[PDB]
Amino acid sequence: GIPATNLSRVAGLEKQLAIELKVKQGAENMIQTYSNGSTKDRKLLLTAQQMLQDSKTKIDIIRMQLRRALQADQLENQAAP
Amino acid sequence: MQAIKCVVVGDGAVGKTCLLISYTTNAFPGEYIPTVFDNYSANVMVDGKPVNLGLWDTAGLEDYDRLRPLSYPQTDVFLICFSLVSPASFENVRAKWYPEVRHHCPNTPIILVGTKLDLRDDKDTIEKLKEKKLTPITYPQGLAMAKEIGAVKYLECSALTQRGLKTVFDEAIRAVLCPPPVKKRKRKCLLL
Numbered sequence: 422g423i424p425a426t427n428l429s430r431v432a433g434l435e436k437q438l439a440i441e442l443k444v445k446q447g448a449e450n451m452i453q454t455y456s457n458g459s460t461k462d463r464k465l466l467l468t469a470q471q472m473l474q475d476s477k478t479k480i481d482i483i484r485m486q487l488r489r490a491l492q493a494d495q496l497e498n499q500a501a502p
Numbered sequence: 503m504q505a506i507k508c509v510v511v512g513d514g515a516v517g518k519t520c521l522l523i524s525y526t527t528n529a530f531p532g533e534y535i536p537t538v539f540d541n542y543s544a545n546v547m548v549d550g551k552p553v554n555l556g557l558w559d560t561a562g563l564e565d566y567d568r569l570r571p572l573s574y575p576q577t578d579v580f581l582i583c584f585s586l587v588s589p590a591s592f593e594n595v596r597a598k599w600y601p602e603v604r605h606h607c608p609n610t611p612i613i614l615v616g617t618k619l620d621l622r623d624d625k626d627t628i629e630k631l632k633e634k635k636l637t638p639i640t641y642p643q644g645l646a647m648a649k650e651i652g653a654v655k656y657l658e659c660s661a662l663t664q665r666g667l668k669t670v671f672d673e674a675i676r677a678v679l680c681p682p683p684v685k686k687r688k689r690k691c692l693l694l
């Protein structure tokens with residue numbers, strides 16, 4: 422695994438999370454676009470909702486794991502699961 | 503206002519956003535920043551009839567598999583972008599893009615684009631291709647490709663010189679008006 426460069430892993434999750442942020446924020450923007458009134462087709466608004474939900478889960482796991490990284494970073498006695 | 507959904511895609515490394523921006527700004531400012539947004543329409547003149555154009559370019563990101571262009575499915579017509587000076591790009595466009603569209607058989611028209619024309623008609627550059635044993639594509643070569651894949655129309659253009667950018671969009675629009683229509687709707691489930 423990683424020796425003392427545990428800081429690298431943490432930043433990696435920050436990056437991954439941020440990437441997903443663009444994904445989540447992207448879908449939401451599209452949602453607000455079709456949310457107002459009825460333009461083009463409703464199918465577009467639906468796709469934005471589903472893709473957005475998927476991203477929500479993405480951030481949820483990445484976010485929690487990130488917290489796990491900093492947690493295990495402080496403690497040096499407790500072993501990993 | 504005739505609003506048509508056209509999505510620009512290409513197996514190449516880049517050239518997806520530059521193609522659309524060149525026609526809307528007459529000059530690509532550059533920018534290497536990835537693509538996330540979508541809202542981007544432009545007015546086009548076809549036969550003297552104002553037409554609303556929907557510009558949607560997909561970024562070269564795999565993670566955005568889910569956040570893929572929502573327009574793509576509804577896209578009245580998608581443009582096939584490849585490098586003319588490189589036969590390989592032409593070899594793979596029909597190789598991967600064709601088997602996918604046929605799997606659904608939407609009967610949706612398909613236009614062909616020959617981006618990067620500035621280096622396609624460049625003697626010195628062409629000479630460089632020889633170094634790699636590659637040769638640029640000619641007009642009749644692509645024309646034949648349109649017949650096999652049943653493409654509605656095939657043309658070549660440049661974003662730097664603007665050979666026939668307007669022609670691409672102009673013809674792409676007709677792709678839905680004259681040839682068979684589009685309109686494709688299908689839900690996955692009641693709840694998400």
Ligand SMILES: Nc1nc2c(ncn2[C@@H]2O[C@H](COP(=O)(O)OP(=O)(O)CP(=O)(O)O)[C@@H](O)[C@H]2O)c(=O)[nH]1
Nearest residue numbers: 516517518519520537561562617618620660661662
């Ligand atoms: N001369 C010339 N250069 C072109 C042409 N098309 C693309 N390019 C060059 O390639 C670049 C491609 O830009 P762009 O299409 O925005 O990149 P992209 O693929 O969208 C970036 P990403 O895939 O990460 O979203 C242009 O900025 C330009 O330098 C063309 O027709 N002619």
Ligand SMILES: [Mg+2]
Nearest residue numbers: 518519537561
């Ligand atoms: Mg782009």
